C-alpha positions as protocol buffer text, in pm:
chain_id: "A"
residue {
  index: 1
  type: UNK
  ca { x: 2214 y: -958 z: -515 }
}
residue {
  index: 2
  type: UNK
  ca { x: 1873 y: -738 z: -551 }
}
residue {
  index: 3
  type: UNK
  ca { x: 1562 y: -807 z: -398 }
}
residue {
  index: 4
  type: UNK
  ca { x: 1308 y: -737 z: -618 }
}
residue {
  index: 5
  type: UNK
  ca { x: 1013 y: -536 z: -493 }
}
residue {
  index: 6
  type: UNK
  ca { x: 660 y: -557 z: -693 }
}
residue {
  index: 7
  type: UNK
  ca { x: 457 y: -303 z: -534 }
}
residue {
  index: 8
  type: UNK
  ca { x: 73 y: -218 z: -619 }
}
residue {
  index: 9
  type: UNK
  ca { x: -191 y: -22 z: -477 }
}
residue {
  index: 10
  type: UNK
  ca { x: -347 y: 345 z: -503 }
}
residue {
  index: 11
  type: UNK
  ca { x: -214 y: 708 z: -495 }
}
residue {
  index: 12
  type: UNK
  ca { x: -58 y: 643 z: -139 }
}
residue {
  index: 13
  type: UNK
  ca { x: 155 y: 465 z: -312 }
}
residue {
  index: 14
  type: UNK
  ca { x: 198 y: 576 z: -688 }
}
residue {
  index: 15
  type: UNK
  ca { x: 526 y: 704 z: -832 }
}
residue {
  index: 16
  type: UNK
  ca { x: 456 y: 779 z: -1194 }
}
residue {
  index: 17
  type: UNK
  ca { x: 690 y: 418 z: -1264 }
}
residue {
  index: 18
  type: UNK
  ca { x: 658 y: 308 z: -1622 }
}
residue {
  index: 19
  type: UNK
  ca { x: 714 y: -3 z: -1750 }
}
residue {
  index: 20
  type: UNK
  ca { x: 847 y: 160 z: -2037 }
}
residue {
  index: 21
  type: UNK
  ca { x: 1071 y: 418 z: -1858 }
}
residue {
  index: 22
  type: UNK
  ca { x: 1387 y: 383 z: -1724 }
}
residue {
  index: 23
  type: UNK
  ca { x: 1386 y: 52 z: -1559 }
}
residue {
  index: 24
  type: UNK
  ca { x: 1590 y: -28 z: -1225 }
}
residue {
  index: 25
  type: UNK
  ca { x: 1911 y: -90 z: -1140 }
}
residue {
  index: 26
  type: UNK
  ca { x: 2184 y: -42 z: -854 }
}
residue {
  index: 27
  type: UNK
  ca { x: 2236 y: 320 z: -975 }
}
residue {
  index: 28
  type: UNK
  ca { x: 1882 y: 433 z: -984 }
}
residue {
  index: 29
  type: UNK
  ca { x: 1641 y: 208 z: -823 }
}
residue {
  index: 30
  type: UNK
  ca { x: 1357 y: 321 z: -846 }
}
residue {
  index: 31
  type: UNK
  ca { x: 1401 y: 322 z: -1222 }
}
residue {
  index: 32
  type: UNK
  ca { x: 1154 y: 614 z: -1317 }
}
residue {
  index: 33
  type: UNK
  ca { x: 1074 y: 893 z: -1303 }
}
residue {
  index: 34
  type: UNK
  ca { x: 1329 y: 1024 z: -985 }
}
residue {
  index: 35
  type: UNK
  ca { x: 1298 y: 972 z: -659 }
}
residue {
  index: 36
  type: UNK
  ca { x: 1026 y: 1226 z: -501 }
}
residue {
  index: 37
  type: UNK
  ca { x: 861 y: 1252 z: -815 }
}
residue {
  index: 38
  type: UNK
  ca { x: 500 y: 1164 z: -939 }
}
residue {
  index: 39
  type: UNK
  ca { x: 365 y: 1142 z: -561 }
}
residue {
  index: 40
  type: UNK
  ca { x: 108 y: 1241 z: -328 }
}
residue {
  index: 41
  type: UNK
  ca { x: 369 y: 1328 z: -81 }
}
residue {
  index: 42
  type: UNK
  ca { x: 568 y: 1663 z: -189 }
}
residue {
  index: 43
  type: UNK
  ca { x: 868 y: 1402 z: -214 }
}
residue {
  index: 44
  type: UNK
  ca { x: 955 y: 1084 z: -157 }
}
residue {
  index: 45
  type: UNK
  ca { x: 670 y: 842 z: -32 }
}
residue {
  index: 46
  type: UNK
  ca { x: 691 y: 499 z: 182 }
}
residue {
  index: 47
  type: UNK
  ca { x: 822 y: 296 z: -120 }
}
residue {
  index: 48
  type: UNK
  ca { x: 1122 y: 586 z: -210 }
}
residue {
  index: 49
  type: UNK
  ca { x: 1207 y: 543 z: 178 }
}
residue {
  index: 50
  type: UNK
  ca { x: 1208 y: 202 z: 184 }
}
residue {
  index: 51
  type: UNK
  ca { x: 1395 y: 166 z: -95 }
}
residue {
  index: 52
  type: UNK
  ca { x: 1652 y: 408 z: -77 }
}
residue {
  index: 53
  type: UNK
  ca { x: 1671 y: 548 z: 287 }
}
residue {
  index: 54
  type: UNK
  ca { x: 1559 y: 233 z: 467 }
}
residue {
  index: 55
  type: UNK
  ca { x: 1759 y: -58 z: 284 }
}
residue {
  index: 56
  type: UNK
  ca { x: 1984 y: -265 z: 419 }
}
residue {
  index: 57
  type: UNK
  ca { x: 2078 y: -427 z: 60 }
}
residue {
  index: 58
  type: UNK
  ca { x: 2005 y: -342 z: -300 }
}
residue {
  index: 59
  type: UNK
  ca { x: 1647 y: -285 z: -327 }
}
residue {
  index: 60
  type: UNK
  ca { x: 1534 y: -257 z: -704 }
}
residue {
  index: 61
  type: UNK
  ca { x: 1163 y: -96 z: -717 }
}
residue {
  index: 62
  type: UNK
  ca { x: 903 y: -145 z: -1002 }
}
residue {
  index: 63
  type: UNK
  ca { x: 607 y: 68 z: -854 }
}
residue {
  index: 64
  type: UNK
  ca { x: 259 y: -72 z: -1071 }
}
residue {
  index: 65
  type: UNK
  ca { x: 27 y: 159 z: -811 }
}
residue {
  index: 66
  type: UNK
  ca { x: -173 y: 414 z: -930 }
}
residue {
  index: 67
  type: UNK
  ca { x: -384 y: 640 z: -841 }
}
residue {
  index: 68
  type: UNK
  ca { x: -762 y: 584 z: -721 }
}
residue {
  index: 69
  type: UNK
  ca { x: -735 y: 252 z: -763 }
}
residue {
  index: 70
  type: UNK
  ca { x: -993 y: 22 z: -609 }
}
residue {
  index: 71
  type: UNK
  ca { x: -918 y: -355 z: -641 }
}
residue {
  index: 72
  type: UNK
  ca { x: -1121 y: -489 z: -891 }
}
residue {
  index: 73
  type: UNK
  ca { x: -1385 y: -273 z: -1133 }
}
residue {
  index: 74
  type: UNK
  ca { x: -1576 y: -556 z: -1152 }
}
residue {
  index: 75
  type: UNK
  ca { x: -1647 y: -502 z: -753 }
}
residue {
  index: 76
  type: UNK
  ca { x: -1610 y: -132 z: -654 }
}
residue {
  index: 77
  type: UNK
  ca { x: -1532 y: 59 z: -968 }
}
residue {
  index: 78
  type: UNK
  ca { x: -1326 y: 340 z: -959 }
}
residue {
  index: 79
  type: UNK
  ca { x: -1038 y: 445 z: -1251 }
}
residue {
  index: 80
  type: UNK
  ca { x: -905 y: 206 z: -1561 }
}
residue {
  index: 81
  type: UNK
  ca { x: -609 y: 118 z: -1308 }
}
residue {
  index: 82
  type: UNK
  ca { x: -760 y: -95 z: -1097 }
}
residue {
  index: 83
  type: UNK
  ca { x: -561 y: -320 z: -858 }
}
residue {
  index: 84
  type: UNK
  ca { x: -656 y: -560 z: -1127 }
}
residue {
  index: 85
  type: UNK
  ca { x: -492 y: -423 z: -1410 }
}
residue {
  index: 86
  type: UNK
  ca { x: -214 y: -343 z: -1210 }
}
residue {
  index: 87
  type: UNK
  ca { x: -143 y: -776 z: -1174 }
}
residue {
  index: 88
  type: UNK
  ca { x: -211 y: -777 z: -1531 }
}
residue {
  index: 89
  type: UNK
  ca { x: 70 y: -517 z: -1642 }
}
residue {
  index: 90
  type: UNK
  ca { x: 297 y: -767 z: -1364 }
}
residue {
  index: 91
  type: UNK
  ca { x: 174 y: -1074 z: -1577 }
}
residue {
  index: 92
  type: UNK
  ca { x: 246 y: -879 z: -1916 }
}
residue {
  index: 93
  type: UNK
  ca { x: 589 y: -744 z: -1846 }
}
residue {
  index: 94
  type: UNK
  ca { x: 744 y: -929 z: -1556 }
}
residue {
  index: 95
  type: UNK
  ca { x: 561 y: -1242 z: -1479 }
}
residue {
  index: 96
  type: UNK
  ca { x: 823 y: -1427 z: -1726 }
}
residue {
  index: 97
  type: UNK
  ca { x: 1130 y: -1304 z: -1555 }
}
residue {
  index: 98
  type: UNK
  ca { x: 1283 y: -1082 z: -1835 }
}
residue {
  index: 99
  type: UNK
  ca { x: 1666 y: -981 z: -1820 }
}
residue {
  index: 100
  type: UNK
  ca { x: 1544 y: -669 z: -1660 }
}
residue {
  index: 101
  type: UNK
  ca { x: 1420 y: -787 z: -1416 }
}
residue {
  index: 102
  type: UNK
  ca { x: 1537 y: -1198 z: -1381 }
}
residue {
  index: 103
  type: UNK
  ca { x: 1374 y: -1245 z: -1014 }
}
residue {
  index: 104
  type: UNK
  ca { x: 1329 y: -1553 z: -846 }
}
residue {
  index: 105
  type: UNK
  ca { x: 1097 y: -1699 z: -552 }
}
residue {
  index: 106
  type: UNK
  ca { x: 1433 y: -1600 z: -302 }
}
residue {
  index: 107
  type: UNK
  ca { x: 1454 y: -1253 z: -440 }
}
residue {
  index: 108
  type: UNK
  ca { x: 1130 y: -1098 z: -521 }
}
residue {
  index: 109
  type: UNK
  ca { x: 876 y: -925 z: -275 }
}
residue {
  index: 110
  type: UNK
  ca { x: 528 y: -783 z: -353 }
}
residue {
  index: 111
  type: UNK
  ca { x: 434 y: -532 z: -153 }
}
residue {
  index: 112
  type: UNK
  ca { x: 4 y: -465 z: -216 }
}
residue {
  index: 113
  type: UNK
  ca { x: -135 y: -137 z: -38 }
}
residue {
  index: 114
  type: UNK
  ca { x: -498 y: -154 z: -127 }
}
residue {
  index: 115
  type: UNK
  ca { x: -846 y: -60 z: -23 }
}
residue {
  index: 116
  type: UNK
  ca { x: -882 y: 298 z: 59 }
}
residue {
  index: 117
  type: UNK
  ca { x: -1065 y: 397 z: -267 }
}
residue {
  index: 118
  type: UNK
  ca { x: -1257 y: 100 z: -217 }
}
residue {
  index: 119
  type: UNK
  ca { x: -1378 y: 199 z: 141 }
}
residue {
  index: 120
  type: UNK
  ca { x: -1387 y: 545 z: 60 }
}
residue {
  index: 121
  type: UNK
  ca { x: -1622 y: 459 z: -223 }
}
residue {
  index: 122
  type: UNK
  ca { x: -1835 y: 193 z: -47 }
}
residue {
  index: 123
  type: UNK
  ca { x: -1890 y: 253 z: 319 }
}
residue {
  index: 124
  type: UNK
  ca { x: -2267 y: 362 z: 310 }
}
residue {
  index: 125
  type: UNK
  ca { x: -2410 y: 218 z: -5 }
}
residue {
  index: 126
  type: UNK
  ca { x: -2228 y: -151 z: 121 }
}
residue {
  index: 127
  type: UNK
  ca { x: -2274 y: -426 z: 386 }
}
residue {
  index: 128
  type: UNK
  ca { x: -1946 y: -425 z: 558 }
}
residue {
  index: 129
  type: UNK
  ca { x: -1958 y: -789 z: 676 }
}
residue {
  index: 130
  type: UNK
  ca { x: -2087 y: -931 z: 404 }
}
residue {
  index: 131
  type: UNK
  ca { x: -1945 y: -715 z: 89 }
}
residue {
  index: 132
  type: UNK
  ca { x: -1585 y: -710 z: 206 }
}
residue {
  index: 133
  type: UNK
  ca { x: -1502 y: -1048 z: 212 }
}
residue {
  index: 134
  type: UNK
  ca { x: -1556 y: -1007 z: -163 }
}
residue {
  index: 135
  type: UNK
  ca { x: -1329 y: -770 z: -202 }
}
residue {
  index: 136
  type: UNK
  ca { x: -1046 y: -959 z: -13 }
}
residue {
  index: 137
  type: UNK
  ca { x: -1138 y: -1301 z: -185 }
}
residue {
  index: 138
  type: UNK
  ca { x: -1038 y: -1080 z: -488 }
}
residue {
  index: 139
  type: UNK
  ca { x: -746 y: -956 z: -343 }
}
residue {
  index: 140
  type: UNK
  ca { x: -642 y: -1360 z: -253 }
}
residue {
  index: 141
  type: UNK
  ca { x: -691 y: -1445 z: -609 }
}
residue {
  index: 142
  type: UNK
  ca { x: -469 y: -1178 z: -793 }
}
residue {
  index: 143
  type: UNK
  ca { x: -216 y: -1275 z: -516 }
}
residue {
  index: 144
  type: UNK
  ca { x: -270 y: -1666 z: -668 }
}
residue {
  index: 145
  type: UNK
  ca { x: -138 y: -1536 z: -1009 }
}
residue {
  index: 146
  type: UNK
  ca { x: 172 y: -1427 z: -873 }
}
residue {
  index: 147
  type: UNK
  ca { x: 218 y: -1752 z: -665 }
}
residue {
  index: 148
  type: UNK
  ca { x: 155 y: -1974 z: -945 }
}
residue {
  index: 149
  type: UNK
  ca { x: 407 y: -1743 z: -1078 }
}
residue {
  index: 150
  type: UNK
  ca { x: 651 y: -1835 z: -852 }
}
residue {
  index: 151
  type: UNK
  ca { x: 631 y: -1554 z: -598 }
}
residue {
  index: 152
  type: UNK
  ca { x: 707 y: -1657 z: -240 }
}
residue {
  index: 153
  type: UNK
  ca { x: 739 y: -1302 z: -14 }
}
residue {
  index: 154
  type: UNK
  ca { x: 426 y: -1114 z: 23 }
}
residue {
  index: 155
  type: UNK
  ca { x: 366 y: -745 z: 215 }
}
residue {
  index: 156
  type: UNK
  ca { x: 33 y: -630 z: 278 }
}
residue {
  index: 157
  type: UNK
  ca { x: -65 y: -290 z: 434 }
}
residue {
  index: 158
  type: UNK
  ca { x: -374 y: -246 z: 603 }
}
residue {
  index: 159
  type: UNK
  ca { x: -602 y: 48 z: 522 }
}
residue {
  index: 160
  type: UNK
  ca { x: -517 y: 381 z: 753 }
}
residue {
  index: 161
  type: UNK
  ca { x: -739 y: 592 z: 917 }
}
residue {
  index: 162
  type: UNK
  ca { x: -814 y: 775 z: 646 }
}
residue {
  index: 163
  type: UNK
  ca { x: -1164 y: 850 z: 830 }
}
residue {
  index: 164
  type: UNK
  ca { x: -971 y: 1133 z: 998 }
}
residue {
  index: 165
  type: UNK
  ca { x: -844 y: 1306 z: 675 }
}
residue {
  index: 166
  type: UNK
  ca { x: -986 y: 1618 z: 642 }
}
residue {
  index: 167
  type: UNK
  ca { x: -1173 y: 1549 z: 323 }
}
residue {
  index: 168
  type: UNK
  ca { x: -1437 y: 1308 z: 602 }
}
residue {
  index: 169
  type: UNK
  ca { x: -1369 y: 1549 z: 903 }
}
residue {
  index: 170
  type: UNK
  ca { x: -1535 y: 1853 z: 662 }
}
residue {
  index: 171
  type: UNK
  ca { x: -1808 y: 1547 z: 582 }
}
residue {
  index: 172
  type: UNK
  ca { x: -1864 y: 1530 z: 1011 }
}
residue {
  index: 173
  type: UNK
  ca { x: -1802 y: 1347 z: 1296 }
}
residue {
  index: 174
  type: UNK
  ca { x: -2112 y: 1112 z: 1213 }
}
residue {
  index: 175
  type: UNK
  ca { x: -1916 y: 1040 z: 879 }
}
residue {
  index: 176
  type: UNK
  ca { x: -1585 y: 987 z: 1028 }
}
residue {
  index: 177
  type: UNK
  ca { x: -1745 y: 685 z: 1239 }
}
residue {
  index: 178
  type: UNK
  ca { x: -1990 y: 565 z: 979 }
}
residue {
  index: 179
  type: UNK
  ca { x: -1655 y: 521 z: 758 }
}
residue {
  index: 180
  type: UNK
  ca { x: -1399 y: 412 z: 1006 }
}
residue {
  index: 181
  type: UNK
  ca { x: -1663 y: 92 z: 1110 }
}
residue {
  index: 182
  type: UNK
  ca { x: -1653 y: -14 z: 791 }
}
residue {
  index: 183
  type: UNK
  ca { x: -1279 y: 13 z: 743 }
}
residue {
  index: 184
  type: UNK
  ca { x: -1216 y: -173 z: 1058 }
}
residue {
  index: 185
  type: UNK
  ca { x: -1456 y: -469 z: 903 }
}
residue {
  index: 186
  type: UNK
  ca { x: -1199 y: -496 z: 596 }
}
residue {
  index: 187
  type: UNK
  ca { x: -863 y: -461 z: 782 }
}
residue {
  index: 188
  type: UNK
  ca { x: -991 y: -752 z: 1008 }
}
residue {
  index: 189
  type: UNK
  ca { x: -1094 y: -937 z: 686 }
}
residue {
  index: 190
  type: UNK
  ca { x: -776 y: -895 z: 524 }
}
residue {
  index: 191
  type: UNK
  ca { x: -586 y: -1026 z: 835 }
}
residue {
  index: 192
  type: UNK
  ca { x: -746 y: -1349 z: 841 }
}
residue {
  index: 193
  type: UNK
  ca { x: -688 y: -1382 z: 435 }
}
residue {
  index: 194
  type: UNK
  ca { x: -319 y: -1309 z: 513 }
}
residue {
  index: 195
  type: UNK
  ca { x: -309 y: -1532 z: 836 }
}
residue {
  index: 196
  type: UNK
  ca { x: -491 y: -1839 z: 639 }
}
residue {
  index: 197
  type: UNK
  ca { x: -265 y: -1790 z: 324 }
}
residue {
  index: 198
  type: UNK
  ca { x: 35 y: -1812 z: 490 }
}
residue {
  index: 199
  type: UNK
  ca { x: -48 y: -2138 z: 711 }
}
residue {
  index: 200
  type: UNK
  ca { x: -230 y: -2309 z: 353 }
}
residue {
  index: 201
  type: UNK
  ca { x: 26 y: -2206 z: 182 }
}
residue {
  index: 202
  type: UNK
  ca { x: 318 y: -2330 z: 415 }
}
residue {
  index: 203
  type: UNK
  ca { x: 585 y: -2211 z: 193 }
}
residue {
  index: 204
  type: UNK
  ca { x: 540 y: -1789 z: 156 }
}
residue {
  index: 205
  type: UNK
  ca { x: 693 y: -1536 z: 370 }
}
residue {
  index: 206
  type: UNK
  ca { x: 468 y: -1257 z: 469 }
}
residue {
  index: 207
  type: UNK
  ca { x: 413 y: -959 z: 665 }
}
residue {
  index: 208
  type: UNK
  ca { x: 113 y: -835 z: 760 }
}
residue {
  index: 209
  type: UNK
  ca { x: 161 y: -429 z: 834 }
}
residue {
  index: 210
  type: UNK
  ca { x: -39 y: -269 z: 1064 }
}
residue {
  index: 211
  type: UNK
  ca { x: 11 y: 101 z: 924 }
}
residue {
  index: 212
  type: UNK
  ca { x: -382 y: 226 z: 1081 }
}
residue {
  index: 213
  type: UNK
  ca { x: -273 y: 142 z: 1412 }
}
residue {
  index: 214
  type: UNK
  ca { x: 100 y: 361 z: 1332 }
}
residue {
  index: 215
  type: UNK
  ca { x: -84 y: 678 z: 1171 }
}
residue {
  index: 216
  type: UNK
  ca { x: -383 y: 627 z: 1406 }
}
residue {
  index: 217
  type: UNK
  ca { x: -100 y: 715 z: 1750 }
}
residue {
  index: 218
  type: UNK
  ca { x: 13 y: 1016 z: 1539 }
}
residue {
  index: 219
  type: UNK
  ca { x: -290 y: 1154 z: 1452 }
}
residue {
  index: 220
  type: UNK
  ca { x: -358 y: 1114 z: 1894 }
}
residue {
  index: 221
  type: UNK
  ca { x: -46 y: 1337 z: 1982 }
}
residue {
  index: 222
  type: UNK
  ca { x: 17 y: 1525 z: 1704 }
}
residue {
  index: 223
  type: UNK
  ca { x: 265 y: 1741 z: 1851 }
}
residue {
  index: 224
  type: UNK
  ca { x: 495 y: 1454 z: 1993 }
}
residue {
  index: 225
  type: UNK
  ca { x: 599 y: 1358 z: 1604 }
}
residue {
  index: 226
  type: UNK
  ca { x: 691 y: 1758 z: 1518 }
}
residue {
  index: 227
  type: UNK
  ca { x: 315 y: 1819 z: 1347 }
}
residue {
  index: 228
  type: UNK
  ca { x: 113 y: 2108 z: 1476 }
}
residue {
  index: 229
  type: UNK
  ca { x: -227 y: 1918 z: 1495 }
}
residue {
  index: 230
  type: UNK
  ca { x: -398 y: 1641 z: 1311 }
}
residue {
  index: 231
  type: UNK
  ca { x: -571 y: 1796 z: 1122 }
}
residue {
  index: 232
  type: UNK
  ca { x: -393 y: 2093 z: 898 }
}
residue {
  index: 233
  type: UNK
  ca { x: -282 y: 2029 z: 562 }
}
residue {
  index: 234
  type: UNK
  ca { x: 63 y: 2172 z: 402 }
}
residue {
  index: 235
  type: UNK
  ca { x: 182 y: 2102 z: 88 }
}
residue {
  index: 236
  type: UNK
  ca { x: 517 y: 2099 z: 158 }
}
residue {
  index: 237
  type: UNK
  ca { x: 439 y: 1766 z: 331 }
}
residue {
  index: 238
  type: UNK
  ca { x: 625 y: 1839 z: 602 }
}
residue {
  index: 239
  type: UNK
  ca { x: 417 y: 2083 z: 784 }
}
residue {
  index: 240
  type: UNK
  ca { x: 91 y: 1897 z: 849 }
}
residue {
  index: 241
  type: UNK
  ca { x: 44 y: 1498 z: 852 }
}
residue {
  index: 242
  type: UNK
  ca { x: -193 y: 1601 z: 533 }
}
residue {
  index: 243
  type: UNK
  ca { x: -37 y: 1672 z: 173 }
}
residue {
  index: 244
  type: UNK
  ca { x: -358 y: 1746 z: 65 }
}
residue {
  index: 245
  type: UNK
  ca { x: -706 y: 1698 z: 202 }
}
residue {
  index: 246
  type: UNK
  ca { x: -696 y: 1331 z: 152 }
}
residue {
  index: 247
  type: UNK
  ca { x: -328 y: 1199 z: 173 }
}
residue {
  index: 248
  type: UNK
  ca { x: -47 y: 1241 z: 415 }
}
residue {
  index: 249
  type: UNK
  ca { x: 306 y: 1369 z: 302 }
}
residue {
  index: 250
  type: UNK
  ca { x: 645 y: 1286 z: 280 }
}
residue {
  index: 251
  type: UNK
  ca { x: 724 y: 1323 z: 666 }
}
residue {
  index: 252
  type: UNK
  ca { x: 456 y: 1119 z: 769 }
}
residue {
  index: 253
  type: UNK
  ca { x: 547 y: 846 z: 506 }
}
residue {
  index: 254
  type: UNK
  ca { x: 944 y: 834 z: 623 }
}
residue {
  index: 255
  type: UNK
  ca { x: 818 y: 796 z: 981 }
}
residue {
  index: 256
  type: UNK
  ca { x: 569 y: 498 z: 840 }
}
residue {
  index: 257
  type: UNK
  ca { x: 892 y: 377 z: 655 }
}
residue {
  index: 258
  type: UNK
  ca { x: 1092 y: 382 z: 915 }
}
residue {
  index: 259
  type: UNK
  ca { x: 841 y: 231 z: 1100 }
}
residue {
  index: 260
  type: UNK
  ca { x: 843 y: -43 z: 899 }
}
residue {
  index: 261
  type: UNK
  ca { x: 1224 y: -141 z: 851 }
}
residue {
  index: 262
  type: UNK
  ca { x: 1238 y: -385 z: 1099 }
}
residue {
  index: 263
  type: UNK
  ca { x: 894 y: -549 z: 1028 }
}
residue {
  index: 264
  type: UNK
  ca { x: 1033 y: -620 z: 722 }
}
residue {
  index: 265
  type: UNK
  ca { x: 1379 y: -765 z: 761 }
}
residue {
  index: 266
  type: UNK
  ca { x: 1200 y: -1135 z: 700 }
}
residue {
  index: 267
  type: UNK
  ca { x: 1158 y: -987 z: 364 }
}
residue {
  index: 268
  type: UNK
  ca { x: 1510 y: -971 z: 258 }
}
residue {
  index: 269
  type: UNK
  ca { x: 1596 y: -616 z: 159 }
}
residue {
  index: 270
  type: UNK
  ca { x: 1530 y: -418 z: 484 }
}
């Protein structure tokens, strides 16, 4: 009946889920804490719409993101959370299929929105070409885990323009493109991982989402999506595209989600 949706990644996508809170069912799925709580958003974020505005079918979400997370700590280090121990808490708690969550290669989807903090961290003391297909080789082997797992249905986001939040603008335009080169060497990078995995693999479902291409149009015409400019911030997250001065709120994440709802009916829940 469910699909289950495994989601990691960094504070674009964190809820404040615990693995020892409420967990999810039909009447509350996103399990903990309530929806709109514990983001960077003012409200709901992309996951809350997806899984409660969005669905076509009973979507039941256990959120492992957290904030600042970089993929692995062994690479770009960053907070204990890394992308990393975020596959590890999956392998502790859910990997085995418990009562509470009995998924299955049909049912389950695992969504992985990951490499901002890692950019943001990286992009001038790092080679681009050659340092980022480390970081997506890592990516492709915490991915294995969950195939050898079982896991079949895979969503990847690419990395959005965050070269254009105001926390780079105030850093200058000669920031803003220094950054966004870089970030445009790892969303190509993790393209081809995605692309390669799913021929080698032969048996996964995936989608590829290209969310820096979707924010990237709103931030050019501002004003045709009901936002002022591109560049205020609001913490309403309704106002501005910008929460705060480094991640967008809950309007711009139900037009991403909404954006997304029919790239994802392959998936199962949407």
């Amino acid at each position: 009946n469910p699909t289950y949706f495994f989601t990691f990644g960094d504070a674009y996508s964190q809820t404040g889920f615990s693995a020892s809170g409420t967990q999810p069912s039909a009447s509350n799925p996103m399990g903990n804490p309530d929806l709109g709580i514990g983001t960077t958003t003012n409200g709901p974020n992309w996951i809350g719409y997806l899984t409660t505005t969005e669905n076509a079918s009973l979507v039941l979400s256990y959120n492992l993101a957290a904030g600042g997370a970089t993929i692995d700590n062994a690479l770009v280090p960053a907070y204990p959370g890394d992308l990393a121990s975020q596959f590890r808490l999956f392998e502790d708690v859910y990997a085995d299929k418990p009562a509470s969550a009995p998924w299955s290669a049909e049912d389950a989807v695992f969504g992985v929105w990951i490499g901002i903090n890692d950019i943001g961290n990286a992009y001038y003391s790092t080679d681009a070409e050659t340092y980022t297909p480390k970081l997506i080789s890592r990516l492709e082997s915490l991915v294995e885990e969950v195939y050898k797992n079982g896991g079949r249905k895979f969503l990847f986001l690419n990395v959005p323009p965050t070269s254009r939040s105001p926390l780079f603008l105030e850093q200058g335009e000669e920031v803003v493109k220094q950054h966004a080169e870089y970030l445009s060497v790892y969303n190509e990078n993790l393209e081809g991982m995605v692309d390669d995995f799913t021929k080698k693999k032969g048996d996964v479902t995936t989608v590829l989402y290209d969310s820096w291409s979707f924010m990237t149009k709103i931030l050019d015409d501002p004003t045709a999506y009901g936002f002022p400019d591109a560049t205020c911030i609001n913490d309403d997250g309704t106002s501005c595209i910008w929460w705060n001065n480094y991640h967008p709120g809950m309007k711009y994440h139900l037009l991403q989600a909404e954006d997304m709802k029919p790239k994802l009916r392959k998936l199962g829940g949407w």
